[PDB]
Write a protein that binds this ligand. Structure first.
Ligand SMILES: Nc1ncnc2c1ncn2[C@@H]1O[C@H](COP(=O)(O)OP(=O)(O)CP(=O)(O)O)[C@@H](O)[C@H]1O
Ligand SMILES: CCCCCCCC/C=C\CCCCCCCC(=O)OC[C@H](O)CO
Ligand SMILES: CCCCCCCC/C=C\CCCCCCCC(=O)OC[C@H](O)CO
Ligand SMILES: CCCCCCCC/C=C\CCCCCCCC(=O)OC[C@H](O)CO
Ligand SMILES: CCCCCCCC/C=C\CCCCCCCC(=O)OC[C@H](O)CO
Ligand SMILES: CCCCCCCC/C=C\CCCCCCCC(=O)OC[C@H](O)CO
Ligand SMILES: CCCCCCCC/C=C\CCCCCCCC(=O)OC[C@H](O)CO
Ligand SMILES: [Cl-]
Ligand code: NA
Ligand code: NA
Ligand code: NA
Ligand SMILES: [Zn+2]
Ligand SMILES: [Zn+2]
Lengths: 105, 116, 114
């Protein structure tokens, strides 16, 4: 499952690796900045949220491919919707980091 | 290959229109969400509070999009197969509810502490 | 308002379904109750209290989405007779990251308070 899924996500999905690095960067940076606990949490969790949604998107993509590689309007709808969910998470992470850092750095 | 980043962006945007055009729940929650975001940007609150007000509400949109994706998959199954238990869609609806409840709690707790 | 009652009944049906079939959801249900009580019984500020609860609530949300994905796979698995696991693996991975995130949240916040 989880550890197995993470391994699959890392090797197979390139977007996931970039997020993994981003999580590592977020944690290191959040710990290096002189900020309060809530801020430190918000900096890390927001980026981890992107990874969570990305994994779910990858899961949906796996189901759709399993149904069929062939082209349908509901197959690509699902993948688009999943892709859209990741975007909002990223938008959320950008807004979060902006608001917090605009005050400190 | 920065070119692909644009490929992925077009996807998400296509998904957004699809959620908007096809899902009514997405249209109504989006209005409440976008309204909430605007208010959160204009309140006299600290950064952490402003972030919590926005993120809790945007999470509702994230979960809804994931719910819509799951519904799309189910509908894809339903076009080939005849019998739909509805269980997958029920769970997706449950996920959105918990997200909305969470957003209500977040806004209640935060607004009650500063303005209380 | 008619659809809202219908959408709520769906959600409630999904919540009840999750409770009976998945033991992990019952544990998370317990954890949410504990998180709220603990956050409300500690003398902490609003932002930390929101984060203590929301981090745990996120785990329940991801689990519900994961269970939905599992249900779809099973419906397909009943038709094609296929036992590939990536959809279920990835869904479980998403829940793990949510749990790890919640642990970090509780650690960082409580280490700062105490
Ligand atoms: N079976 C299918 N039927 C219809 N459209 C499909 C499809 N498979 C893919 N598409 C379309 O192509 C896009 C890319 O497919 P897919 O979602 O699998 O991308 P991907 O895994 O390469 C990138 P990412 O993981 O970042 O989302 C989808 O967003 C959708 O618009
Ligand atoms: C104001 C500055 C704030 C900076 C900090 C904000 C938080 C980090 C943002 C996103 C995490 C993930 C990064 C983007 C993930 C890759 C994008 C993607 O999915 O692209 C398609 C794929 O890469 C095909 O190659
Ligand atoms: C104060 C308010 C400031 C607000 C500022 C907000 C500006 C937009 C921010 C980030 C966009 C980053 C680029 C978009 C990310 C790539 C597209 C995407 O979502 O790709 C997912 C991909 O398919 C993988 O699954
Ligand atoms: C202590 C007093 C404090 C009071 C402050 C409370 C403010 C709640 C704020 C945001 C919730 C946002 C929820 C966004 C999603 C809900 C959408 C929804 O359910 O909409 C109803 C539907 O449209 C009908 O037809
Ligand atoms: C201050 C800024 C306020 C901004 C405006 C906020 C207005 C709405 C508030 C609460 C509505 C709560 C609604 C709760 C009903 C949920 C129904 C449900 O379970 O829906 C499942 C979902 O629709 C499946 O997609
Ligand atoms: C500060 C205010 C805090 C407010 C409190 C936080 C609310 C958390 C939300 C949902 C929990 C739902 C738990 C799952 C319930 C499922 C239904 C159930 O128990 O079903 C069993 C059934 O009886 C078998 O026959
Ligand atoms: C400070 C310790 C106080 C003692 C009591 C703590 C309980 C409060 C809940 C969560 C804490 C953070 C844990 C992070 C994950 C929470 C959800 C979780 O682990 O749920 C069970 C899981 O699904 C596997 O079955
Ligand atoms: Cl059980
Ligand atoms: Na159609
Ligand atoms: Na729907
Ligand atoms: Na299960
Ligand atoms: Zn993919
Ligand atoms: Zn995709």
């Amino acid at each position: 499952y989880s550890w197995k899924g993470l391994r699959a996500a890392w090797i197979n999905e390139a977007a996931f690796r970039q997020e993994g690095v981003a999580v590592l960067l977020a944690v290191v940076i959040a710990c290096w900045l002189d900020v309060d606990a809530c801020t430190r949490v918000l900096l890390i969790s927001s980026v981890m949220l992107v990874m969570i949604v990305e994994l779910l998107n990858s899961a949906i993509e796996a189901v759709v491919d399993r149904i069929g590689s062939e082209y349908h309007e509901l197959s690509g709808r699902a993948k688009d919707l999943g892709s859209a969910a990741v975007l909002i998470a990223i938008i959320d992470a950008v807004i979060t980091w902006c608001i917090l850092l605009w005050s400190h750095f």
